[PDB]
Design a binder for these strands. Sequence first.
RNA 1: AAGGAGGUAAAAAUGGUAAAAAA
RNA 2: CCGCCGUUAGUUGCCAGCGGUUCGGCCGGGCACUCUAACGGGACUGCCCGCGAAAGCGGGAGGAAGGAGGGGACGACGUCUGGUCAGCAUGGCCCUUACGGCCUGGGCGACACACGUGCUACAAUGCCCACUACAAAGCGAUGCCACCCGGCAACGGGGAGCUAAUCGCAAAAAGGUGGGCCCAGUUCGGAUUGGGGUCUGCAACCCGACCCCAUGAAGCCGGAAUCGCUAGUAAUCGCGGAUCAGCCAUGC
Lengths: 60, 99, 155, 207, 79, 127, 125
Amino acid sequence: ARKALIEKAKRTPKFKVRAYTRCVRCGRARSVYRFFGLCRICLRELAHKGQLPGVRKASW
Amino acid sequence: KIRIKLRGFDHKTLDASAQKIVEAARRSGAQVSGPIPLPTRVRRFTVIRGPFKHKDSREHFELRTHNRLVDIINPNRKTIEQLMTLDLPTGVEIEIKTV
Amino acid sequence: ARRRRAEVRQLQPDLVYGDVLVTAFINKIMRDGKKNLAARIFYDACKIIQEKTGQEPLKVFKQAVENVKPRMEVRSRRVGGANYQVPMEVSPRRQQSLALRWLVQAANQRPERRAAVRIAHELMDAAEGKGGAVKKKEDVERMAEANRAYAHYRW
Amino acid sequence: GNKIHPIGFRLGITRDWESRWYAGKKQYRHLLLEDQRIRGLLEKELYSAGLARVDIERAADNVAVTVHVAKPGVVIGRGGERIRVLREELAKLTGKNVALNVQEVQNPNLSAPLVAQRVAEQIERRFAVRRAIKQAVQRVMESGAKGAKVIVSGRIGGAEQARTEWAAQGRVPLHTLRANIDYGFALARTTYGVLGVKAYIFLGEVI
Amino acid sequence: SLKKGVFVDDHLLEKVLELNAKGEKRLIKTWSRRSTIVPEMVGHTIAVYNGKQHVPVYITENMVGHKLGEFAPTRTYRG
Amino acid sequence: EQYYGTGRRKEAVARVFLRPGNGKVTVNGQDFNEYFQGLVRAVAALEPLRAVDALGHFDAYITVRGGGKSGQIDAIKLGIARALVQYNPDYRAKLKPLGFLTRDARVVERKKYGKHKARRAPQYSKR
Amino acid sequence: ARIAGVEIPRNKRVDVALTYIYGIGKARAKEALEKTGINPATRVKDLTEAEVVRLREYVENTWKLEGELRAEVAANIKRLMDIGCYRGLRHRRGLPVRGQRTRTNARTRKGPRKTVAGKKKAPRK
RNA sequence: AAGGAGGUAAAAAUGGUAAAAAA
RNA sequence: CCGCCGUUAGUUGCCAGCGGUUCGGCCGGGCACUCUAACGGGACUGCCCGCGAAAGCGGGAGGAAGGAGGGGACGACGUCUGGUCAGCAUGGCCCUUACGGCCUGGGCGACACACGUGCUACAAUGCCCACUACAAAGCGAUGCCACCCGGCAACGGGGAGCUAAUCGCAAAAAGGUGGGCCCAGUUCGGAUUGGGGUCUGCAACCCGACCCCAUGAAGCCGGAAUCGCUAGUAAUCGCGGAUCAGCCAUGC
């Protein structure tokens, strides 16, 4: 698995409701903020490396 | 009658735009609507600690786009001329609309 | 807390009559976050008092205060492998606290018709002395007396 | 032990993004994608001479192929032919507009990421960790900072019990904001597994 | 479920019209237990697919407007 | 001519305008006695003008919005208190020992992550 | 006032009275209270028998109640035992008809609870 | 009330768990 | 980040100043005032009175702000051979026309208990119906949908504006004004269930959700013992978001 997962999402089968997010820079389908196309930790790692723009270490 | 909306990411060059901009429009023309600040647009993201099953213990992160506004009253040649090209928003873009 | 001696902090200078104890009693009448209708209710009761009797509401209030005063309340002494159940002279702040709260729950204890009604009728009998909080007053007095052996076992 | 990213801790006024353009809510994600793949393809096929800043300036199709490297001359080409191919591979995998940048900062021991990279280079080729690495911290302080802390986690010499070494010198105030601490993590990798090479570098205040 | 219309496999209806065209042998064996037992299935042996075997069920009428495999338990042992 | 009070509490802007008169006081359009009916703390906010007995001689135009009704009331406390502390700064020195100068600090703290109501921690098991 | 199945409500709002009847929720109460005439607010005890009798006429006519209702449901229950449709399969079992849960919660569509011996677990310390 | 020292009374429901070893 | 003040700024706001008003800040205009968001100022035991060898201490004053002003992000040297290769990498090990890929469905929702943690309740500060006002925040272009109409409703037809502080989700609820219920398993409570629609989606049986009628159980405040909370905190009450076609969301 995992390998043919990204395929299923990269290939987009038939009906609309067989789709599911994908952390393109980590590889996960669940809890993927479909604004970055990133999982929680993919988002976090790019955020911390100093590699995420517009965004900031929120502290309100 | 000239509505120029500022879509930036950092309030630095965004207000630094605002200033020089309003000058060279007062320069090559006349009255300029002073840089009016639209409420800075922020997005909310609430991630967690580690990749390991932890729910609680978290870190939240915020996206910070800024929005401002500059207007004038007259479409003189020189105004348009200078302030249509003489730009440098390496990380900012705008929206020209009329009224 | 261990570093401090905390505080009581002044409550609210009664939104109407002009005295802390009124909005204190209302404070303990309050339905958790709904001071509004509790204060209302209370004043329904008070004005009904004033339409039933000819004695002042604040007066009869002070008479409730006095009628339920735990001069000596019962706690416990320090002795390792036991606890001496020991009474002691209370502080008028704690006396009044306990008191007014007891009046609150004595009013609550009456399976009556309405809130203002319960609070009122209670306030009547309790200020009189023929009341629940009063009975528990005289009772805890009995506790501080039947434990007058623990009169020098007060921490 | 944690230590929330001193880099992501410097976000306020002590570090600006490695990417400064405008991004609209729609085309934002895709910009993040395109850019990320770009950066990545730089990283490896433009490893060669070691680099830190992977900056990008964009807006409407303009692309600032911007890099802070340790060396330019042997990554520009023997006849300016390395810039050629690479820049063009970008414009090929990013059918838009490209413009290289090989900005160089004169000091290697200064700026963490590449010192971490070189330290990790030492052990990757099997050298004695503690010695060479401690004296590496001492190279960094030979340059002259106020603090340098290169810790190294992973399998030391094998022996299963993969611990973490302790190498540092000088004061290191990563609690402080206005201090500018360059931090670089090099990925060490032995035939017997993976080691982690973290390098902290303390600049100073009033900046 | 379905609101304006109703669900049933199309290969079903098309197979209804054949088995009815002759009134042939028994055994309808859907590999699809979904499809509603819609009115025009009369009362024939339904070897619906479990996930295991082809659970056969003699349909009557007290079940018409309600799914096929809805009648196989599949989940073994009860209480 | 005018007596302006900048009034605020727990985010509720009481913009206070005053002129002299008798008791014509309009809270954001409507009379006092409807814009805050039922609340006992309403007349409470009528303490500053009542502590100086210049309660009457005022025809106020009070634009009050945002936040909450009772919070509006307290906001008008600060507003009134600010409007007169302006046009006769004698009342200033004598009103601070009544507290009618302090704005507020009692604000609904952020709901903390991990816990329920900003502080309400989730129940503990262990066993 | 035995209009329905031996149903006598007595002194109260006619609507509450009606509500106390099987087959009649408050909706059907006010429904009959707009179709038969009779005033809801007015007490049912002090009624006038003309409006009363025409009321009971409209009531049992246009719709029916407990006698058939539940029994009918028990006939559609006979069907729920016709083959053992999973609905009636589970109804036969003595468990909820919805495929919800039954691991922990089942205190209504089943009895309370009937103790075992736990059967214990797997390491937790 | 400082310490330190010199003799008298206080104070553990229960606990089995190993091991070549890694520097 | 949040309270006081300050400079600039004007499709949110404003008659605060006047003019008119299908009498709507709608039609001129201002920026003081709401406000929105950048650069600041402002508080230090700095001062007054007393005490303490000093730290520090009580009282009091100017103050929007007292002696750490309220919250956040910050979490060392290091312990736990703690966890996660089922996010990710990476040593070793095993399989390799199968322990790999696709598909279909079934399943992870099971039921004799036990337990965690939650929700709504068991009620006259209450529950039902009617009436009138104040939210902060985020979200929204095959999304947000105003709006008229259809239908008891779900939801649908026609159909304005908007890449928005300008159009919309939006209906806040608690409040409060006016009537019912009148201590009853009660018009309390919605669990169980049957009878029908709609919407989602290829498709809803196991397995979605919404809505209409009816059934209206248990449950009349809960022992051994145990939770949380020191101030805009407890409780109470409402709302936006992320992932989402939908939704089992009482989760966060």
